[PDB]
């Protein structure tokens, strides 16, 4: 004779779709705490600020200088308050800097013969004076003369160096002559393994903070034993130094949740989530020892026995031991993933974005099928083994 429970729960097996049991556990987590609390991880709150703005030296992001992180939180109110600019490959640079995990900056003494340095604009106001990015140097003609620049910097250290530079796109030809003394400029930044040649484009653009011009941002990586050569003739936004590229665990997240104080290992844009259960329903975007994503609201595993409404210790202990062994195998063991691909897009681009969405949808469908089959199998065998003890 078995025992029965006045209450009950309904589970799914392979042969039967609805079975009443004595006790069932939920393998999918449907709620979060709402706070991204960084006790085991290092979390940087990028209020007012994006990652690229902190990299370039926005006046507002001045407090992010030389700061390391394990996760970067980027909010929806983030804006720019400096010279308008664009990055031809925004996602690649964002991912590279996010995975590097450090904003360490070391100055270098470039030669820069016969030019005016530290140009400032009124679009960027630091304190109460016009200014510019703190990690870039605006090179402007001096005495209506802009000599050709040919500067070299070797990499004698034991790590890769990241250089961020730019090209200025003026609005009119008069502006180009007034700023760089030549009708058309050309920039050539090369190493022993790669070359980038950029030609500026002149034309009007919509005014952002009374600025009709733009800036295009480029990056270069210099390996040990290499030399970085800059041979611009005009329209150069020079680098003021080099950043450090590291390999490790680090990523960037887009969320709007407050930061608190608790030891949670798994972070989602909604908040921190416990990782005891093997699956989740909250968000596709995760960071660090997180249960896998399924599109099921409930997935209950029969941690009990069927009911049809003295004691024996050996059989009870055997059944309890087997069920707890199954639970130990499932609950607790969770893999860690750092810096996956993007899963949310604010624009429409085309082929690559469709490929990314297809990959994520395939993953979600396959893992949902796996979860359903696993729960069905375990419930069927649990019922079978508990009925085999009689």
């Amino acid at each position: 004779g078995h025992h029965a429970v006045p209450n009950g729960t309904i589970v799914k097996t392979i042969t039967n779709d609805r079975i009443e049991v004595t006790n069932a556990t939920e393998l999918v987590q449907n709620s979060s705490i709402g706070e991204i609390c960084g006790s085991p991880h290092q979390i940087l709150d990028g209020g007012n600020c994006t990652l690229i703005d902190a990299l370039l030296g926005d006046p507002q992001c001045d407090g992010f200088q030389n700061k390391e992180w394990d996760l970067f939180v980027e909010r929806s109110r983030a804006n720019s308050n400096c010279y308008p600019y664009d990055v031809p490959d925004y996602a690649s640079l964002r991912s590279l800097v996010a995975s590097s995990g450090t904003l360490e900056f070391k100055n270098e003494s470039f030669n820069w013969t016969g030019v005016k340095q530290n140009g400032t604009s009124s679009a960027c106001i630091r304190g109460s004076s016009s200014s510019f990015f703190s990690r870039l140097n605006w090179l402007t003609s001096l005495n209506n003369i802009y000599p050709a620049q040919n500067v070299t910097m070797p990499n004698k250290e034991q790590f890769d160096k990241l250089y961020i530079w730019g090209v200025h796109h003026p609005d009119t030809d008069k502006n180009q002559i007034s700023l760089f003394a030549q009708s058309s400029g050309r920039i050539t930044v090369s190493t022993k393994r790669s070359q980038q040649a950029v030609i500026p484009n002149i034309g009007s653009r919509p005014r952002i903070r009374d600025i009709p011009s733009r800036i295009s941002i480029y990056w270069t990586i210099v390996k040990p034993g290499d030399i970085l050569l800059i041979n611009s003739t005009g329209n150069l936004i020079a680098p003021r130094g080099y950043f450090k590229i590291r390999s490790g665990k680090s990523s960037i997240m887009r969320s709007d949740a407050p930061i608190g104080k608790c030891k949670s290992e798994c972070i989602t844009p909604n908040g921190s989530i416990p990782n005891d259960k093997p699956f989740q329903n909250v968000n596709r975007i995760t960071y660090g020892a997180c249960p896998r994503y399924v599109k099921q609201s409930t997935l209950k595993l029969a941690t009990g026995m069927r009911n049809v409404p003295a004691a024996d210790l050996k059989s009870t202990q055997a059944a309890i031991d087997q069920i707890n062994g199954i639970l130990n195998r499932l609950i607790g063991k969770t893999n860690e993933k750092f810096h996956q691909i993007e899963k949310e897009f604010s624009e429409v681009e085309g082929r690559v974005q469709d490929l990314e969405k297809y990959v994520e949808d395939t993953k979600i469908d396959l893992w949902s099928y796996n979860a359903e089959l696993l729960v069905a199998l375990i419930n069927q065998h649990t019922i079978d083994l508990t009925d085999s003890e009689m």
């Epitope: 030296g57 001045d62 407090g63 200088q65 030389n66 360490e104 900056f105 070391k106 100055n107 270098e108 530290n118 630091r126 304190g127 004076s129 200014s131 703190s134 004698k156 250290e157 003021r240």
Partner: antibody, heavy 124, light 107 residues
Framework: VQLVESGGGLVQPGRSLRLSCAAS????????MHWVRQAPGKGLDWVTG????????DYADSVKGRFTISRDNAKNSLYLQMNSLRAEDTALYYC??????????????????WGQGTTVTVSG | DIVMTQSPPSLSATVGDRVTITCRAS??????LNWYQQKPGKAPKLLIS???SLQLGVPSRFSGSESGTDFTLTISSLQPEDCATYYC?????????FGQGTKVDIK
């Protein structure tokens, strides 16, 4: 491009002094400014420093509570005030300038400009 | 504070020879080491910042390197103008930790 200094002299123990550093030839409201003292034939020591916004101010352990550092960006000047002097502070003082173009913090930089020090003697 | 240690308290070399100065730090500083040169009776002049970046105007015979958690300053041809005291400094944390000097003489 120079940083000149004034205000040194001979003062008795337990009294006050005020040193002034004037900067010319560069944009003052961008670089951090420090003070560094050297004893006669002993070595170099760090006493205090200030940023461009006067937000982060740091002092050495042996000068905490008696020394004050201030800056005026409009007048291009850096001031130090000593209140309770002792015989361990008789040294030559240098008004030094930082290297980073716009640093929010006092760390992660070097001293790329040094002034010719002024002498401070604390004795009977 | 982070104590700094310089190996040779005083060094003598012939004109044209090779001179090496070594520095060690108590803790780990992310290559934020600066080298300073002081002639007698003058203000210090910064030679190398970042332990590998030569400042403009410094002769090319001065080189800075990092090896085995030690920092080295090398002079390839010791001209008579290079008799001074050489100091090391950090920039990671800010208590201020100029190390003791190394005095160089010429035979």
């Amino acid at each position: 491009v120079q940083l000149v200094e004034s205000g040194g002299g001979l003062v008795q123990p337990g009294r006050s002094l005020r040193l002034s550093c004037a900067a010319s030839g560069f944009t003052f409201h961008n670089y951090a400014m420090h003070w560094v003292r050297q004893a006669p034939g002993k070595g170099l020591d760090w006493v205090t420093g200030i940023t461009w916004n006067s937000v982060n101010v740091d002092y050495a352990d042996s000068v905490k509570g008696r020394f004050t550092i201030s800056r005026d960006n409009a007048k291009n000047s850096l001031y130090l005030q000593m209140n309770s002097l002792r015989a361990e502070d008789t040294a030559l003082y240098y008004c030094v300038k930082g290297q980073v173009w716009s640093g929010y913090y006092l760390t992660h930089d070097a001293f790329d400009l040094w002034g010719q020090g002024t002498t401070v003697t604390v004795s009977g | 504070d982070i104590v700094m240690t310089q190996s040779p308290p005083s060094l003598s070399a012939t004109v044209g020879d090779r001179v090496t100065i070594t520095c060690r730090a108590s803790q780990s500083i992310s290559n934020y080491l600066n080298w300073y040169q002081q002639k007698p009776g003058k203000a210090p002049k910064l030679l190398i910042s970042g332990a590998s970046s030569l400042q403009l105007g410094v002769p090319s015979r001065f080189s800075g390197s990092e090896s085995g958690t030690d920092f080295t300053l090398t002079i390839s041809s010791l001209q008579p103008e290079d008799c001074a005291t050489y100091y090391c400094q950090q920039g990671y944390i800010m208590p201020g930790t100029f190390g003791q000097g190394t005095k160089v003489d010429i035979k």
